[PDB]
Ligand binder design. Structure first.
Ligand SMILES: O/N=C/c1ccc(-c2ccc(O)cc2)c(Cl)c1O
Ligand SMILES: O/N=C/c1ccc(-c2ccc(O)cc2)c(Cl)c1O
Lengths: 234, 9, 235, 9
């Protein structure tokens, strides 16, 4: 491998430079219909997915996996990864979800799509939780990588994935020790961060279910790439 | 799969 | 509150003594299996297990200090996560088999007798294999189960108290790992490995919850009133 | 709610 040789400072710089760009929404003069808001979200997700693959390939250890393992991990965590990115962008905008710099939504916009307010409330709760925890960008890129490797690990090669997961854990602890936190505060914060991933998984399952209902309704056009990512969960 | 082409490219 | 005034060793002993019993199944081995009977065994067992889980949650430090509304909400969110991690724990020494009860040992081939149940079985089997490889200790198990109870519903002042208890359970897990001779690097790593598994238990519960609502709409399986209330709490 | 009753019993 090559990720196991990296120092924790090198691991951070590798992940920071691997960050995908912030894409703009295709929006403008639209009070949102239920079909227009979901169109923006799915269109943004489809274009964000293209950058996620290049980001995943730049995650230390992901290139060492077989093509099928890479597909399986991405097929399981893609919506989690999009959501934790949305949650991260929305930190400095309390009560608002920054889907894009030109697409800032609150929970009232969630009422424009049935079943969306519940997902909105959960996303806002995670974002406020990151705000209270004072989540740093160095920590965020570690959590996003952990989601990628961990979410599909339970469906030799897995021994390497767990070895890379240990490395990112070491990197998280290094970041907290570098910030002046005590040893007790280090494992406490590590525990607080990883327990949020359980809820990110929960929101993904709720959102994955909501996306399936949009398909059977077929009012919202879904890209073939998006349909294939969706068919991998059911 | 489309995901296959994206990972390889 | 008293959960904060507890040392790590006192926290472990309190959780261990609060452990619910291992209930048996109403399983007649001379009854041929059917999709209605196997699901009837899993739901009947879960219904009797819920009664003990309610009294186990009261003995969890910090849970009693919460309002009854918060208690109802946390149990409605995590009751299947807790049932599953318990099932996974009991089945740790039975590879390829899920020990729902001492008289109810099932493999994935029996899960095919119920539609959509194989996918949940394999995830439960993989979780049990993961605990076996990690050599999960009983002291660590009662902590993870208590973490699930307090953490699964915390996102829907009382919330600050819940996180104060959660941090104490983390101090407990680290205390156990330091006591077992692990280095500080190994301590953080195992702590991370254990908490990352809760993400999969959450995933299994989400899937099991959806499959349960599927059983309700077909109504070939009789569901107890307590089980139907827990099911309507997620949707 | 049944859960509410069992929690206060
Ligand atoms: O039915 N709705 C499905 C859905 C799809 C994508 C997204 C999404 C999430 C994060 C993004 O950066 C961008 C987009 C959301 Cl929030 C959804 O609810
Ligand atoms: O549709 N029904 C789903 C379902 C319900 C309960 C249980 C269950 C789990 C653990 C127990 O101790 C006892 C029972 C399982 Cl594994 C299920 O898949």
């Amino acid at each position: 491998s090559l990720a196991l040789s990296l120092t924790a400072d090198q691991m951070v710089s590798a992940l920071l430079d691997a960050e995908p760009p912030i894409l703009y929404s295709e929006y403008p003069t639209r009070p949102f219909s239920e079909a227009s808001m979901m169109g923006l979200l799915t269109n943004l997700a489809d274009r964000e997915l293209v950058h996620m693959i290049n980001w995943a390939k730049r995650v230390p250890g992901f290139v060492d996996l077989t093509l099928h393992d890479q597909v399986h991990l991405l097929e399981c965590a893609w919506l989690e990864i999009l959501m934790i990115g949305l949650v991260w962008r929305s930190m400095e905008h309390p009560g608002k979800l920054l889907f894009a710099p030109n697409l800032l939504l609150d929970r009232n916009q969630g009422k424009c799509v049935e079943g969306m307010v519940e997902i909105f409330d959960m996303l806002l709760a995670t974002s406020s939780r990151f705000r209270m925890m004072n989540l740093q960008g160095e920590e965020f890129v570690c959590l996003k990588s952990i989601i990628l490797l961990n979410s599909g690990v339970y469906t030799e090669e897995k021994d390497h994935i767990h070895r890379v997961l240990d490395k990112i854990t070491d990197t998280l602890i290094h970041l907290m020790a570098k910030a002046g936190l005590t040893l007790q505060q280090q494992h406490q914060r590590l525990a607080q961060l990883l327990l949020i991933l359980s809820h990110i998984r929960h929101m993904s399952n709720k959102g994955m279910e909501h996306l399936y209902s949009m398909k059977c309704k077929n009012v919202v056009p879904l890209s073939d790439l998006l349909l294939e990512m969706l068919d991998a969960h059911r | 799969k489309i995901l296959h082409r994206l990972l390889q490219d």
